[PDB]
């Protein structure tokens, strides 16, 4: 599309500038253009892709939650009828959010996942696929909701299976995947016990492997372990 005439390296350079300027929509457009060049992404480039889209969809999700809360209050007994505007605007934001999720899922399907053979890349992309189906599930209310939830579960499960076989328990991708799959269990799949078990087992297995790490790797892993601990403290 619009980035077809820009060099791959220039798109990557501009994505990094956009990150510095907090221009995450631009960042995502640059990284989409880079993916569409058709070459595999390096570790750093995968991170740039993830940062960009997580910030874009994060703003949409936060706005959707604000609007959904207002709409819920409007449907409480004793609330005045204000017309269709709250629903319409929540739907507008929802449709834009779904479009971003579909865009990311489309990049993963055409053709990031099929070309990713190393564990670090394949797990990363499958985690992303689970995440963006999970964001679709956050807003789903209709007849495809069960299939959206199962698509998130299936992507997370394949990422877990690979990560357990091919990565150490302290690997940051393995840890971030487990954190997100645990959130999926807690708040999407109505399985809080599974969420707690996964977070606890992930934390404890990482703790036992910290002794193998350099100081810098220890810092990377313990940062994510603290997020698991934060959730365990909230949930128990």
């Amino acid at each position: 599309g619009a980035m077809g005439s820009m060099e791959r390296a220039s798109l990557i350079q501009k994505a990094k500038l956009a990150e510095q300027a907090e221009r995450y929509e631009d960042m995502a457009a640059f990284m989409k253009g880079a993916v569409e060049k058709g070459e595999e992404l390096s570790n750093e480039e995968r991170n740039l892709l993830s940062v960009a889209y997580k910030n874009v969809v994060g703003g949409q999700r936060a706005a959707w939650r604000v609007l959904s809360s207002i709409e819920q209050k409007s449907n409480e007994e004793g609330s005045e009828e204000k017309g269709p505007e709250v629903r319409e605007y929540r739907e507008k934001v929802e449709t834009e959010l779904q479009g971003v999720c579909d865009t990311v899922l489309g990049l993963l399907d055409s053709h990031l996942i099929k070309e990713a053979g190393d564990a670090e890349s394949r797990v990363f992309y499958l985690k992303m696929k689970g995440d963006y189906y999970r964001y679709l599930a956050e807003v789903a209310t209709g007849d495809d909701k069960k299939r959206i939830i199962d698509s998130a579960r299936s992507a997370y499960q394949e990422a877990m299976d690979i990560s357990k076989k091919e990565m150490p328990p302290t690997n940051p991708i393995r840890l971030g995947l487990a954190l997100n799959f645990s959130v999926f269990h807690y708040e999407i799949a109505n399985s809080p016990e599974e969420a707690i078990s996964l977070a606890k087992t992930t934390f404890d297995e990482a703790m036992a492997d910290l002794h193998t790490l350099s100081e810098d790797s220890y810092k990377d892993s313990t940062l994510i372990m603290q997020l698991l601990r934060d959730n365990l403290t909230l949930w128990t």
Binding site: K54, L177, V183, E187, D230, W235
Partner: peptide
Amino acid sequence: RRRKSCQ
């Protein structure tokens, strides 16, 4: 307190 995901 909102639960953490990987950000």
